[PDB]
Amino acid sequence: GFARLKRSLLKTKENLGSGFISLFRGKKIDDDLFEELEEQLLIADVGVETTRKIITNLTEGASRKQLRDAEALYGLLKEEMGEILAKVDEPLNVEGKAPFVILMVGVNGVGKTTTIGKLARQFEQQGKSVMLAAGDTFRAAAVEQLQVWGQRNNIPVIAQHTGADSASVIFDAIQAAKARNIDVLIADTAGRLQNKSHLMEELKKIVRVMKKLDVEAPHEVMLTIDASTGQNAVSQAKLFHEAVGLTGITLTKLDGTAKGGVIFSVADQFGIPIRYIGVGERIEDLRPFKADDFIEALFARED
Ligand SMILES: Nc1nc2c(ncn2[C@@H]2O[C@H](COP(=O)(O)OP(=O)(O)NP(=O)(O)O)[C@@H](O)[C@H]2O)c(=O)[nH]1
Ligand SMILES: [N+]
Ligand SMILES: [N+]
Ligand SMILES: [N+]
Ligand SMILES: [N+]
Ligand SMILES: [N+]
């Protein structure tokens, strides 16, 4: 089973899941084993704190059951790491709002704009009308690229002149979405980390201004982070979550990176639903995150 996701996770499986099998083969459970496993979890970008929790719980579980052979730790690890991901398995539901507003936050270069387009096309295939807001207002090339994409896909894009107030652009986009019976409004935002506190104030202003039109907006504050950036994804998530409060995460570029284990650090550190994982270039390769599929793909040795 899960042959496709196993292929997407091939490089990550070298260290996690089925990658554990060679580590445990023929070994006893002792402090040396747990030191080796800790090292491998850290190399896989699971993170110092999440790795410490896993090791602590495995040690107690192995001792409680008086396990002898390292091979038995495999199933315990599958349970511990599977529970981490199951706690953030909650798909995004965009139904029933006029419009449902998604505020897309994150730094530049991690897949935010790509994810906006994939989400927009997915919602359209579901029968929904979509509109985009070009709220990254000081990056003229990025605004223009979003407008070009919208024109190519017959999806309206609300934009103002270079340097416009992002909260004003997004307010106008909500007004336009309401006026034109739009089902989903996806708002792009700036992603410059230079002087990060200014960006966070910009995002908080966007959120405050939305409430004049709909106290429920934004219905989703979605972070986009890039698994190939390792623990940078975790520090980005902490920055945005402490600043504005996330309600969902998209983790991109899981295909081909050996750093996919960062998903456990993101899940455990914040407890925010992971809505989507990116595993390729097609629209359909932005996949709703399913924790069981993910853990089975990672830990299975068959194909
Ligand atoms: N291999 C892979 N690449 C992805 C995935 N999602 C996004 N990307 C790629 O990552 C790059 C960054 O995409 P983009 O959306 O342009 O990034 P951004 O966060 O808006 N800012 P910038 O314009 O600097 O890129 C693009 O080349 C994109 O095609 C994914 O899921 N897998
Ligand atoms: N950590
Ligand atoms: N939905
Ligand atoms: N300017
Ligand atoms: N405001
Ligand atoms: N691959």
Task: Write phi, then psi, for 278 (nearest 5 degrees).
Answer: -100, 120
291 is in an annotated binding site: no
User: In terms of residue numbers, what domain contains 255?
Assistant: 100-299
Cβ–Cβ < 8 Å for 130, 155? yes
List, in sequence order, every beta strand (DSSP E) within 136-281.
157-158, 184-189, 220-226, 248-252, 274-278
Distance 92 CA to ligand 3 centre (A): 6
Cβ–Cβ < 8 Å for 210, 101? yes
DSSP string, 245-299: --SEEEEE--TT-TTTTHHHHHHHHH---EEEEE-SSSGGGEEE--HHHHHHHHH
Q: Which of 13, 16, 36 is nearest to 81 (CA)?
A: 16
Distance 217 CA to ligand 5 centre (A): 14
CATH label of the domain that carries residue 208: 3.40.50.300
Question: Which resolution in angstroms does this entry have?
Answer: 1.6
**280 Cβ closer than 6 Å to some ligand 6 atom:** no
Q: Spell out which residues line ligand 2, taking CB within 6 angstroms.
A: 47-49
CA–CA distance from 256 to each of 7, 11, 125, 224, 265 (Å)? 9, 6, 28, 18, 19
Distance 119 CA to ligand 5 centre (A): 29
Query: Cα separation of 46 and 139, whole Å?
Result: 34
Identify whether residues 104 and 78 lie together within a single domain.
no
What tokens appear for 142 in the block?
């990025």
Identify whether residues 51 and 104 lie together within a single domain.
no
Rounded to the nearest 10 degrees, what angle do helices 140-153 and 112-125 cross at? 20
Amino acid at 268: D
Distance 205 CA to ligand 5 centre (A): 5
113 is in an annotated binding site: yes
**256 Cβ closer than 6 Å to some ligand 6 atom:** yes
Identify whether residues 202 and 157 lie together within a single domain.
yes
What tokens appear for 37 in the block?
């496993």
DSSP string, 2-50: -HHHHHHTHHHHTTSGGGHHHHHTT-B-SHHHHHHHHHHHHHTT--HHH
> Of 52, 87, 122, which closes a domain?
87
> Of 41, 63, 87, which closes a domain?
87
How many H-runs (helices) and E-runs (strands) does the chain carry?
13, 8
Q: Which technique was used to obtain these atomic coordinates?
A: X-ray
How many domains does the chain contain in total? 2
Question: Scanning the structure block, which residue is given the tokens 């199951």?
Answer: 86
Identify whether residues 79 and 104 lie together within a single domain.
no
Identify whether residues 121 and 249 lie together within a single domain.
yes
Identify which ligand lies nearest to the alpha carbon of 205.
5
Identify whether residues 192 and 236 lie together within a single domain.
yes
